[PDB]
Amino acid sequence: FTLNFGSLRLVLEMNGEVVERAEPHIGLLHRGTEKLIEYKTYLQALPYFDRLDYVSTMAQEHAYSLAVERLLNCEVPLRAQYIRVLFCEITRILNHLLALTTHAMDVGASTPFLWAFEEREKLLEFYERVSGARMHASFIRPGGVAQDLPLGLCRDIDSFTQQFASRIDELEEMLTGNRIWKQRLVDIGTVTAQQAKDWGFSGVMLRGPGVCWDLRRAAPYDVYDQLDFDVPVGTRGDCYDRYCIRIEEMRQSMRIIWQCLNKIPSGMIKADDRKLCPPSRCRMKLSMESSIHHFELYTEGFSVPASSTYTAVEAPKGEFGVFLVSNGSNRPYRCKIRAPGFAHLQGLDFMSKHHMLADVVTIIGTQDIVFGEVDR
C-alpha cells in the first residue's frame, strides 16, 4: 500500500511496515534561481548562491567566486584566501552542527540541539561582526572579500575554538556510545562505494563507504595545500560511521581554523585591479578613475571572457559545483547549480529499501537534505 507524507513530500510503498520503495517529490521549493541568475549580473547573482544550501552559506559564495575567477583569471591576495578558508571552515562547522542536531532530534534526542545552537549563535555573531547579517552574508566576492576583518575577531575565534573543542567532546560523550543511538544508526541505510559512485554521492556520504577521496586534497582550491589537516573515512558506510565522520570533520575544521588564525598574513582583502574589484570609498571619492570604475562596476559588471567551466568545492554537504557559461557580456548566459543534495535524495530510494519509517527519517537526517539547494 502507498502511504503519503506532506517542504518534504514523500510516498512510500509498504508491505509489513517494511519500506519497499520511497519516492520523494521535491519541486515544492523551486524558485527559478537559474533563470534569475541568467537575468541578473554576477554581483547581483551572488546572493542567489547565498540562498542556495542556506545552512552552509559561504561555501556557495566560495564556489561561485572561484568559478568567476576561473573564467576571469584574477589573482586573489593571500590574506583574502586565508580569511575565505577560515570562514569556509566556520561554515562547515555550522552546517555539521545543524545536521547532527537535527538528525538527533529526528531520532529523538532533543537536548544537544540547543547546545549546538548556542555554538551556532556564537558563529553567527562572528558572521554578523565580520559582515552584514548573521545569515546570507554576501561577504565572499570574486577577486577577494567585501571587507576586512574587524579587530578582535581573531581573539574571539580562538576563544570559541577552545570552548568548541570542549563542546565537541561534550556532544560526542552524550551521543556516541549510547545504546539507543547505536541501535538507531548502525546498519541503517548502508551504501557500498560502487553504489555511491553510481549514484553520484559526494562528501561525507561518499567517504562513508570509504572511497578515501576528498575535494580539498584532490583539487586544493585554497591554502588547503598548506594546512595539513585530516580527512576521515568510514570502514563500512552507514549512519553511525557518517555521524562519526561528521564529528571528525568538525574537529579538523577547528584545526584548520586555528592554523588560518595562526598564519594569516597582512595585506589586502581583494583583487588589486579596479576593473574587476570595486575601489574603496576614499579612493572613489578622491580619484577620478576610481570614481569611473566604481560607477561602471556598480551599474554594469565585469565582462568575463566568453567561456564555459565547471568549478566544484567541498561544501559541508558534499561537492557543490557551479557550471558557468558566458558570452562575453556582463550577465551569465547559463548557470547550472549541482548541489550535493540532489544526488543524495536520489540515493534515498535504494538507501531506505527494506527499512522502516524511522529508518527512512534517520536516512534523511544523515543525508542532510536542504531543499533549497535541491530545488535550485
Partner 1 sequence: VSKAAEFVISKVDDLMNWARRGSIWPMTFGLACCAVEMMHTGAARYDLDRFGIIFRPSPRQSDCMIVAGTLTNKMAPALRKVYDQMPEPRWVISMGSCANGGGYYHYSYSVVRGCDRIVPVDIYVPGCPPTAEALLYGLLQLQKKINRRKDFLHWWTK
Partner 2 sequence: DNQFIFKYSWETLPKKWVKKMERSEHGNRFDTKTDYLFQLLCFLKLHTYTRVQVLIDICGVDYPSRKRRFEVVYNLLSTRYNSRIRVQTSADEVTRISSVVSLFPSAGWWEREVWDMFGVSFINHPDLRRILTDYGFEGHPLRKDFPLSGYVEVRYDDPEKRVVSEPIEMTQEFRYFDFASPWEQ
Partner 3 sequence: TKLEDEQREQLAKEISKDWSSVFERSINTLFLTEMVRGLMLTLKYFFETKVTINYPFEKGPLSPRFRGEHALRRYPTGEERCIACKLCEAICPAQAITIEAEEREDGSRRTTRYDIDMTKCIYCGFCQEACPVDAIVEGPNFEFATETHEELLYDKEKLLENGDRWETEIAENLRSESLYR
Binds 165: which of ligand SF4, partner 3, partner 1, none (CB < 5-8 Å by kind)? none
CA distance linking residue 67 with residue 33, whole number of Å: 17
Sole window of 90-98, 128-136, 227-235, 237-245 interacting with partner 3 (rule: CB under 8 A): 128-136
Q: Does residue 51 touch ligand SF4 according to CB under 6 A?
A: yes
Residue 280 in contact with partner 3, rule: CB under 8 A: yes
Determine the angle formed by the axes of helices 153-175 and 239-263, rounding to 10 degrees.
160
In residues, how long is the chain? 376
Q: How far apart, in whole angstroms, are the C-alpha atoms of residue 308 and residue 136?
A: 27
Which grid cell sits at 195? 553504489
Q: What does the angle CA 104 – CA 136 – CA 130 come to, to the nearest 5 degrees?
A: 105
Residue 255 contacts partner 1 per CB under 8 A? no
Q: Is 53 in contact with 372 (CB distance < 8 Å)? A: yes
C-beta of 63 vs 370, nearer to ligand SF4: 370
The 82-101 site mask, x for binding partner 1 (CB under 8 A), equals ----------------x---
31 or 129, CB closer to ligand SF4? 31
| Between 181 and 221, CB nearer to partner 3 | 181
What DSSP designation does 73 have?
A: T
Coil, strand or helix: which one is 252? helix
Question: Residue 48, interface with partner 1 (CB under 8 A)?
Answer: yes
CA–CA gap between residue 41 and residue 301 (Å, rounded): 7
DSSP string, 330-365: SS-SEEEEE-TTHHHHHHHHHHTSSB-HHHHHHHHH
Considering beta carbons, is residue 25 or 275 the nearer one to partner 1? Answer: 25
The CA–CA distances, whole Å, from 233 to 97, 187, 194, 211, 213 equal: 19, 16, 15, 8, 9
Any residues with CB less than 8 A from the CB of 110 and at least 6 apart, and which? Answer: 104
Under the binding rule (CB under 8 A), the answer on residue 357 touching partner 3 is no
Q: Residue 217 interacts with partner 3 (CB under 8 A)?
A: no
Other Cβ atoms within 10 Å of 153 Cβ, number: 16
* 52 versus 269: smaller Cβ distance to ligand SF4: 52
**For residue 19, what is its C-alpha cell?**
519500506
Options 15-23, 114-122, 174-182, 357-365: segment touching partner 1 (CB under 8 A): 114-122
29 or 153, CB closer to ligand SF4?
29
Report in angstroms how near the CB of residue 25 gets to partner 1 at its nearest.
9
Most distant CA atoms of the chain, gap in Å: 76
By CB under 8 A, residue 178 contacts partner 3: yes
Residues that bind partner 2 (CB under 8 A): 26-27, 30, 32, 34-36, 39, 41, 70-71, 197-200, 211, 213, 218-219, 296, 299-301, 303, 307-310, 312, 319, 321, 323, 325, 328-330, 333-334, 336, 338, 342-343, 345-346, 375
Residues that bind partner 3 (CB under 8 A): 40, 43-45, 47, 111, 115, 118, 125, 128-129, 131-133, 136, 138, 146-148, 150, 170, 173-174, 177-179, 278, 280-282, 284-285, 291, 294-295, 298-299
